[PDB]
Amino acid sequence: PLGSDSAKLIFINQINDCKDGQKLRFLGCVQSYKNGILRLIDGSSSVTCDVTVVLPDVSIQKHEWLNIVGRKRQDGIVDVLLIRSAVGINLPRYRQMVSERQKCD
């Protein structure tokens, strides 16, 4: 159900720079969760994530951080395929490595 394509590791602020249908992996902070729509933010950026088909079996707390693997539906909207808690993650080191991976060949 995930497909054999490799996910592009990016920041939420880069989602709109990618093509629809592309598999993406990113970290986001829970802003709200209603009507099958999970809104995640990172700084001033945000993205609407459809989790209707992948409803977590545990409650989601506002402001908690989640790792997401999904496909871009259109600008600002991602169809979620996998969700995992990123509790305790060192955000500064994580963003440093995401940036380095995009810059190093």
Partner: protein, 136 residues
């Protein structure tokens, strides 16, 4: 030699000459370590295969030969898609697509383990690249 921590896209770039070891940037490679999340699980006759994605642009089939280690093989199919694993194994180039025959693995449940794995791999690749450039 060592345990060569690598990104999957680079594993797919190792060169073989069918006629035990492969070559990466001119360096002989056999034992490798990869880290990524499980994208899929396939069951075969006598082996379980985990497809792993480290976001490097390519995924890698990780093979667990059941009879070689029943214990580890059992732990392997106890995994679920999305779980992150650190796998140590040897490269296998029998088919056009290289695969990794697992010798050991551990599930990584600390969210910080993954970026540390990425850090280690970028540093390792940079050092090997410099060495290769100085010797060639």
């Amino acid at each position: 030699s060592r345990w060569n921590p690598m990104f999957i896209s680079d594993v797919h770039k190792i060169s073989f000459h069918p006629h035990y070891i492969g070559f990466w940037m001119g360096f002989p490679i056999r034992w490798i370590q990869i880290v990524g999340y499980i994208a899929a699980i396939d069951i075969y006759e006598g082996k379980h295969v985990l497809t792993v994605d480290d976001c490097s642009g390519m995924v890698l089939r990780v093979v667990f030969i059941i009879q070689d280690d029943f214990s580890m093989s059992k732990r392997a199919i106890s995994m679920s898609p999305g779980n992150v694993v650190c796998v140590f194994g040897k490269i296998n180039s029998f088919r056009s697509e290289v695969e990794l025959i697992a010798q050991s693995f551990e599930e990584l449940r600390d969210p910080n383990d993954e970026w540390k794995a990425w850090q280690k791999r970028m540093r390792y690749k940079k050092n090997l690249t410099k060495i290769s450039k100085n010797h060639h």
